[PDB]
mmCIF file of C-alpha atoms in Angstrom:
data_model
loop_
_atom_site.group_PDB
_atom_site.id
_atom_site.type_symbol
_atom_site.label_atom_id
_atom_site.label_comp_id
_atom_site.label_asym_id
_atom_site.label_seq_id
_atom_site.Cartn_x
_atom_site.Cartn_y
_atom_site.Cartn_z
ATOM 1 C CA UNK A 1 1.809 11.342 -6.844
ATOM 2 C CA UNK A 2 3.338 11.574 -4.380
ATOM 3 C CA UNK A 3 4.607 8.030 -3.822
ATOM 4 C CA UNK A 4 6.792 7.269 -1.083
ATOM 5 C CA UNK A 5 10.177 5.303 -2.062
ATOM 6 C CA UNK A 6 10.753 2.591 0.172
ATOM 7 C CA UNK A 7 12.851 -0.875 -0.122
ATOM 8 C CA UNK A 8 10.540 -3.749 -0.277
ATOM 9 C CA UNK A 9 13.254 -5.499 2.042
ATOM 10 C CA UNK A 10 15.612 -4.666 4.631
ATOM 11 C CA UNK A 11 18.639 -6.862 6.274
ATOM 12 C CA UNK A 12 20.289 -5.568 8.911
ATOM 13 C CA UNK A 13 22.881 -6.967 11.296
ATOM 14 C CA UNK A 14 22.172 -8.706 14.589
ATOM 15 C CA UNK A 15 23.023 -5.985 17.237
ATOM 16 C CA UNK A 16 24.095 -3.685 14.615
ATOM 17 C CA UNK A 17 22.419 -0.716 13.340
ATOM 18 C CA UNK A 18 19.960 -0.633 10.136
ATOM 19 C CA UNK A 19 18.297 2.454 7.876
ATOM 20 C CA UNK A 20 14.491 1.671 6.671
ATOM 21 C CA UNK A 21 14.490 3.999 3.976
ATOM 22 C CA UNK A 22 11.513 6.174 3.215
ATOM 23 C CA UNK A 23 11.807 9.063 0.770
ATOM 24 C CA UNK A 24 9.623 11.188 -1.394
ATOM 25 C CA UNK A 25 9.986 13.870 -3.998
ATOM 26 C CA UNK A 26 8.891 17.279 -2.146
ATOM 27 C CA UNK A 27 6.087 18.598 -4.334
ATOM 28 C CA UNK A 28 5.370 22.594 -4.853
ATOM 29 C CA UNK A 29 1.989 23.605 -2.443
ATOM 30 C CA UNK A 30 2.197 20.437 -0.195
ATOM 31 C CA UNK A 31 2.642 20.801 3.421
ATOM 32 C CA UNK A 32 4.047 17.994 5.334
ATOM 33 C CA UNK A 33 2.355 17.593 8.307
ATOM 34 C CA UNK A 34 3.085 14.275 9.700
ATOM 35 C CA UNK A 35 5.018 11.265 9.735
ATOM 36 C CA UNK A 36 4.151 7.906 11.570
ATOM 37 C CA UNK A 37 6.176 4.553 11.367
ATOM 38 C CA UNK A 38 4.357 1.343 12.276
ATOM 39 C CA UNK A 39 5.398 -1.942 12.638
ATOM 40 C CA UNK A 40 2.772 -4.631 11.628
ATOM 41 C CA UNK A 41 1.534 -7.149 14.395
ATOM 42 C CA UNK A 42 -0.983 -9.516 12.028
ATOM 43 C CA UNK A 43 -3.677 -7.612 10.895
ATOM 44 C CA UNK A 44 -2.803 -4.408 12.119
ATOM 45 C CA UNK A 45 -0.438 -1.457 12.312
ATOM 46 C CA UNK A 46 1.186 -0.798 15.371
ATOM 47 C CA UNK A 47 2.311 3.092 15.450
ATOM 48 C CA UNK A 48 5.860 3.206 16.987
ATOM 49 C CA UNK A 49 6.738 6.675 16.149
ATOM 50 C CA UNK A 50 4.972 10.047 15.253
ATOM 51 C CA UNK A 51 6.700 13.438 14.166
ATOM 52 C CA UNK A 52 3.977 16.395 14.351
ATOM 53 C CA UNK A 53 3.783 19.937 15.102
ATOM 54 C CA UNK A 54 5.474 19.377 18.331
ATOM 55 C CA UNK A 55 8.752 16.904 17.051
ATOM 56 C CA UNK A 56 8.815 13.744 17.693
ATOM 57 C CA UNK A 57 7.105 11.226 19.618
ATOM 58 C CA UNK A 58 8.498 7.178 20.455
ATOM 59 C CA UNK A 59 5.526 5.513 21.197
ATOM 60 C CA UNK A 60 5.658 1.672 21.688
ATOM 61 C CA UNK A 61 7.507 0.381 24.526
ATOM 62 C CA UNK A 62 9.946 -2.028 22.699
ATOM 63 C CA UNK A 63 11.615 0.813 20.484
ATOM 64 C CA UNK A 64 12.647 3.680 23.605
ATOM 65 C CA UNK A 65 16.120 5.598 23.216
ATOM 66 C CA UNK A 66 17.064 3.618 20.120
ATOM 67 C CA UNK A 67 15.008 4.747 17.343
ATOM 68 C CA UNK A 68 15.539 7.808 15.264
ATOM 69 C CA UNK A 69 14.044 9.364 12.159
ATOM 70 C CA UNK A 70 15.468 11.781 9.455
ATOM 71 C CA UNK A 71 14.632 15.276 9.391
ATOM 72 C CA UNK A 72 17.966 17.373 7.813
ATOM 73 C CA UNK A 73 16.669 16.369 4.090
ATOM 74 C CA UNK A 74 13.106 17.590 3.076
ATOM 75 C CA UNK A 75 11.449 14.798 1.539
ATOM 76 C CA UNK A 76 13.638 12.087 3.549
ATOM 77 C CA UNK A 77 12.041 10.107 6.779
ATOM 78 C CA UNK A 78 14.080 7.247 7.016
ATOM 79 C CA UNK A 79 13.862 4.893 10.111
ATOM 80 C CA UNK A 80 16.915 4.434 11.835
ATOM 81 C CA UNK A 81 17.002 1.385 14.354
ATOM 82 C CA UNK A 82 19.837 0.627 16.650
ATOM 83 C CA UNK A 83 20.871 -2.676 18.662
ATOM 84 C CA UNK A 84 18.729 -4.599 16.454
ATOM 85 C CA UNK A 85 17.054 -7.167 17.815
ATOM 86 C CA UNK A 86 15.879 -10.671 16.541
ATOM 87 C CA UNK A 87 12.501 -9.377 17.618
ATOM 88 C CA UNK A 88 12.702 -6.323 15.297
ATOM 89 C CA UNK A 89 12.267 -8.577 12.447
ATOM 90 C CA UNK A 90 8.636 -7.646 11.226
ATOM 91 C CA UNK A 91 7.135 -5.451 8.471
ATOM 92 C CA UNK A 92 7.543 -1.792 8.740
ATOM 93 C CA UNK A 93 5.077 0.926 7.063
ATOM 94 C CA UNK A 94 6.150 4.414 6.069
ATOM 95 C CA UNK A 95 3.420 6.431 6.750
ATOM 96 C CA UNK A 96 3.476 10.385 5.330
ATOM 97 C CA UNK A 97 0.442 13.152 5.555
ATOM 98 C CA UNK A 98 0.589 16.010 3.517
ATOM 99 C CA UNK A 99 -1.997 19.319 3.498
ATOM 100 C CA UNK A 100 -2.388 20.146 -0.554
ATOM 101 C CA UNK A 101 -2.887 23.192 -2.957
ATOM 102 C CA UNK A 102 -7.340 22.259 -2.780
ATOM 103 C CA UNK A 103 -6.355 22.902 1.282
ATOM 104 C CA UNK A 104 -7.337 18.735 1.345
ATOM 105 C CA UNK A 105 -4.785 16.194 2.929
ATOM 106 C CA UNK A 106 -3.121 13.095 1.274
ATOM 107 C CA UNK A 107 -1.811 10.293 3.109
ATOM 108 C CA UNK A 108 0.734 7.784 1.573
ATOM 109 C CA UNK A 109 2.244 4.583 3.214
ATOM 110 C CA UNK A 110 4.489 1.979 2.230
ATOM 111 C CA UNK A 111 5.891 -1.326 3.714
ATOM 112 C CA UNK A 112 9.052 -2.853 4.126
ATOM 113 C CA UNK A 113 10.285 -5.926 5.456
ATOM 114 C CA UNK A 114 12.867 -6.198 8.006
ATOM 115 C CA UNK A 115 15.155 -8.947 8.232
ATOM 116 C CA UNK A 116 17.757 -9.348 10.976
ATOM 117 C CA UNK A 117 20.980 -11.496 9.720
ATOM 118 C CA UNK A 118 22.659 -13.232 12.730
ATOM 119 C CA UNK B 1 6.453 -11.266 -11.104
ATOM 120 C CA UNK B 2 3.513 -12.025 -13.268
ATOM 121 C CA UNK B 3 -0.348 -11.034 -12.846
ATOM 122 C CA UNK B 4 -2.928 -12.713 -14.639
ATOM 123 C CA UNK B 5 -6.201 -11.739 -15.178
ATOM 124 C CA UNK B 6 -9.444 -13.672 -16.108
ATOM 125 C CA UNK B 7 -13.458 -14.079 -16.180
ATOM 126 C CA UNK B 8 -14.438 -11.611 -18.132
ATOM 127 C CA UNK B 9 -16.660 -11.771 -20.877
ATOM 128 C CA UNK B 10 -20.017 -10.658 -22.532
ATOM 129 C CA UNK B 11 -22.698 -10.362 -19.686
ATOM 130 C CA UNK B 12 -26.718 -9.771 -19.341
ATOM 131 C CA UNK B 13 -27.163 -6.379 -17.774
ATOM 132 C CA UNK B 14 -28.078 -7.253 -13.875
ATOM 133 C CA UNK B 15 -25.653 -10.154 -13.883
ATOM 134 C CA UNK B 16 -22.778 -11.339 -12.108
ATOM 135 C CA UNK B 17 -18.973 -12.213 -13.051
ATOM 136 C CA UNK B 18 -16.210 -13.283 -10.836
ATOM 137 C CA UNK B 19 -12.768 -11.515 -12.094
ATOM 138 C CA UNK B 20 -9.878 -13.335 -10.752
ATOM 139 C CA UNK B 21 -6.096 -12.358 -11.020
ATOM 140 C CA UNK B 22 -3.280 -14.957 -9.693
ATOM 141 C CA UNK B 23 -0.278 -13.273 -8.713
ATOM 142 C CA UNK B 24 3.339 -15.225 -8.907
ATOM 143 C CA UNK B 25 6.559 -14.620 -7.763
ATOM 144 C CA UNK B 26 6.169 -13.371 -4.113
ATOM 145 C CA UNK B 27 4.418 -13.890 -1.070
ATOM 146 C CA UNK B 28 1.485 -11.536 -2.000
ATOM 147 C CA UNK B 29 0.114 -11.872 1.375
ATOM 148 C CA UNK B 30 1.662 -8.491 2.289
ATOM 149 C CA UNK B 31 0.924 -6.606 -1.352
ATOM 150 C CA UNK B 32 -2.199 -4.248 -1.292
ATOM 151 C CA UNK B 33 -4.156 -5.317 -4.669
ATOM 152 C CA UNK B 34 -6.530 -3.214 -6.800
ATOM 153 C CA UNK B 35 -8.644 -3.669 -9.563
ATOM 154 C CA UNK B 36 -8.709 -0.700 -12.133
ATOM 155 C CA UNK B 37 -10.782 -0.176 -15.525
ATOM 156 C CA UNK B 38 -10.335 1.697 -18.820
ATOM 157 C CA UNK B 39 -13.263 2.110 -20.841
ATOM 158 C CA UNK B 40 -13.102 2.687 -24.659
ATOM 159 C CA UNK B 41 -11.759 6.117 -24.997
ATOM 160 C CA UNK B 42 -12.147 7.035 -21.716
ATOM 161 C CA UNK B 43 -8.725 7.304 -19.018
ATOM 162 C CA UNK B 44 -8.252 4.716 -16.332
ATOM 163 C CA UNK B 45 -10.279 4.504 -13.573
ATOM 164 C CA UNK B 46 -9.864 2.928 -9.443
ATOM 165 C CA UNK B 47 -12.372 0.585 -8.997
ATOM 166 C CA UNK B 48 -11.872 -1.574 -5.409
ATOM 167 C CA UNK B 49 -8.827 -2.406 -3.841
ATOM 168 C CA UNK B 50 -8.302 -5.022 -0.379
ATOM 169 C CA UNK B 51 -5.355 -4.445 1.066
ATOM 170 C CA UNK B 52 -2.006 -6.539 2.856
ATOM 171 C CA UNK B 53 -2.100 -8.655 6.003
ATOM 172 C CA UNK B 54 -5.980 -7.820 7.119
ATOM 173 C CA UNK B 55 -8.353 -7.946 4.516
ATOM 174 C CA UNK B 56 -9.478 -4.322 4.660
ATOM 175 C CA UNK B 57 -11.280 -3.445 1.610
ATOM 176 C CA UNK B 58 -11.969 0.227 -0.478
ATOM 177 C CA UNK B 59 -15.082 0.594 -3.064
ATOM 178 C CA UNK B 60 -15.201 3.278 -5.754
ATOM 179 C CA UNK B 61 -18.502 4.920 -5.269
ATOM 180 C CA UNK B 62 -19.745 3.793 -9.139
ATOM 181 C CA UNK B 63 -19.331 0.511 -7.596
ATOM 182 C CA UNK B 64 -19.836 0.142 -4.224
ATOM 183 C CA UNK B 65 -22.676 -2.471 -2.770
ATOM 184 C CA UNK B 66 -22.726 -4.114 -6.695
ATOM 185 C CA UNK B 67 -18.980 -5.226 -6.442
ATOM 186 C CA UNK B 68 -16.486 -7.133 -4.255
ATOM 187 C CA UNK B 69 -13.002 -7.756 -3.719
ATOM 188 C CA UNK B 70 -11.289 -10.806 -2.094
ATOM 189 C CA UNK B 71 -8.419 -12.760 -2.192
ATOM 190 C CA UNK B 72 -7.061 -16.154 -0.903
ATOM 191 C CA UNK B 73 -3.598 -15.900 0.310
ATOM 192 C CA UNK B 74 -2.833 -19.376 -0.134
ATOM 193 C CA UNK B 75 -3.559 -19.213 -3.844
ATOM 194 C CA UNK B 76 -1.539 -16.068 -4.326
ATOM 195 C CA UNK B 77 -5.170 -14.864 -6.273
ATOM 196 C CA UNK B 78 -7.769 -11.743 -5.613
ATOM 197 C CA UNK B 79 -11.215 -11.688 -6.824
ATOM 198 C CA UNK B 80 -13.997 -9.546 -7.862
ATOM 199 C CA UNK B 81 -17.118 -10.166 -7.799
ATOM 200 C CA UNK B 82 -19.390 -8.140 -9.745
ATOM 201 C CA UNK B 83 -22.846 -8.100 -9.184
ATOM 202 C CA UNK B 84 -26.274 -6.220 -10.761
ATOM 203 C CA UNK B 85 -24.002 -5.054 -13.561
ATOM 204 C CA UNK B 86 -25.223 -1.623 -15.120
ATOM 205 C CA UNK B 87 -23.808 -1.413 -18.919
ATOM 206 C CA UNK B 88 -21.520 1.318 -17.643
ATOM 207 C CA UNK B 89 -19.657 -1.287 -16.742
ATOM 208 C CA UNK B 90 -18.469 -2.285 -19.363
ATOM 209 C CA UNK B 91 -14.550 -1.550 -19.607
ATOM 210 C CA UNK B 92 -11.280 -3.513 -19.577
ATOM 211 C CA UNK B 93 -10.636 -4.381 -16.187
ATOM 212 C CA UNK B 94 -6.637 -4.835 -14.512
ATOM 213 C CA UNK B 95 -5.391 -5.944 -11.389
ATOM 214 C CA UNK B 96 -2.760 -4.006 -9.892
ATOM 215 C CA UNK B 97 -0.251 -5.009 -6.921
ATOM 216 C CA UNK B 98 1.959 -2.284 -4.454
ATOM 217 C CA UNK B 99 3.127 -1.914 -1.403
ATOM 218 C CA UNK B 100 1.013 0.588 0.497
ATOM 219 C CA UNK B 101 -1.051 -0.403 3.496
ATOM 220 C CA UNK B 102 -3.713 1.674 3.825
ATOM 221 C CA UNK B 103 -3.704 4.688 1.847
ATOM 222 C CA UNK B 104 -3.192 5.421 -1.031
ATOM 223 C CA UNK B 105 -4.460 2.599 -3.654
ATOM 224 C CA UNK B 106 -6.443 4.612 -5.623
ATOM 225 C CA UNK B 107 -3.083 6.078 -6.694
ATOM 226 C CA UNK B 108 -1.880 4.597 -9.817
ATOM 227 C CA UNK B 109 1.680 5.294 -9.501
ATOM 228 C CA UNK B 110 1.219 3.478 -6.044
ATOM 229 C CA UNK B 111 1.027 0.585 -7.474
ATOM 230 C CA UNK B 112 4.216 -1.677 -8.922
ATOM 231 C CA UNK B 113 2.714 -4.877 -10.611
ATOM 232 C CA UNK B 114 0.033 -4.642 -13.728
ATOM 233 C CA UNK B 115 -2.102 -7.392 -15.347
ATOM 234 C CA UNK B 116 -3.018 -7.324 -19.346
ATOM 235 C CA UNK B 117 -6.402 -7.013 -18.098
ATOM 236 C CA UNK B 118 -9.783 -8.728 -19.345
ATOM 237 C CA UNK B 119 -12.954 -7.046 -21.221
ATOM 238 C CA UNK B 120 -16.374 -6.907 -19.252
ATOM 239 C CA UNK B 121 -19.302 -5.662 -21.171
#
């Protein structure tokens, strides 16, 4: 703990919207501090969005005014991509940082796949 | 789907093994995969870990520079080599497969898929 719940696959509909789930059970004395999603290019992560101490960030180029995250439910990041693309398709990691009780920090990711049905 | 274990055995102290687990059922090409061990009486214990896509790799200190993780992708299989075995060693040792990506596979709860494991001493 904690483990991040995420959907080891995603299909969403060409043009359509989609939901990457990420979720987590909010544990007493842990401080959420950031969130990143990354999109995998080979062997490495790609960050395409950040939420820190001052909101939210849309980094790569390819995901501008059409990517949002969750942020009314504690514990619930979900991805939300719009006007999917056949491009899109990829794998996705959750990525959440917490501050803990010892004053350390714990990082958890987890990957999905997205799929983009035509 | 299934993980299987194997290579272990009865070994001189200063040795060398190679553990090997085959993995079936998905393209484990994007699964992180650990090795973990349970000595007699004692709780289970992270031991390396390589994770998905690149083959980044993560050492527990009691074995770092004596042991190795790899895996070939094609064959769906990760292996550890183990190397200038102290006794302490000895253990049952499991193979473990998740979905994180670069933290958090030391975790066991992080981790989805379990071998039976196979006894190193």
């Amino acid at each position: 703990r904690p483990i991040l719940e995420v959907p080891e696959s995603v299909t969403g509909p060409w043009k359509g919207d989609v939901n990457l789930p990420c979720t987590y059970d909010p544990l007493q004395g842990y401080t959420q501090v950031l969130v990143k999603w990354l999109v995998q290019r080979g062997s490495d992560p790609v960050t395409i969005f950040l939420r820190d101490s001052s909101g939210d960030h849309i980094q790569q180029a390819k995901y501008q005014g059409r990517l949002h995250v969750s942020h009314k439910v504690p514990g619930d990041v979900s991805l939300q991509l719009s006007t999917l693309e056949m491009d899109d398709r990829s794998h996705y990691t959750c990525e959440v940082t917490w501050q803990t009780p010892d004053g350390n920090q714990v990082v958890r990711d987890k990957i999905t796949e997205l799929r983009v049905q035509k | 789907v299934q993980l299987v274990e194997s290579g272990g055995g009865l070994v001189q102290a200063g040795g060398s093994l190679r553990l090997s687990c085959a993995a079936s059922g998905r393209t484990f090409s994007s699964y992180g995969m650990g090795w973990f061990r349970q000595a007699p009486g004692k709780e289970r214990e992270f031991v390396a870990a390589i994770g998905p896509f690149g083959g980044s790799t993560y050492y527990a200190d009691s074995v770092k520079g004596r042991f190795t993780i790899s895996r070939d992708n094609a064959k769906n299989t990760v292996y550890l080599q183990m190397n200038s075995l102290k006794p302490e060693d000895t253990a049952v040792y499991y193979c473990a497969a998740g979905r994180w990506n670069r933290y958090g596979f030391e975790d066991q709860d992080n981790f989805d898929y379990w071998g039976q494991g196979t006894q190193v001493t």
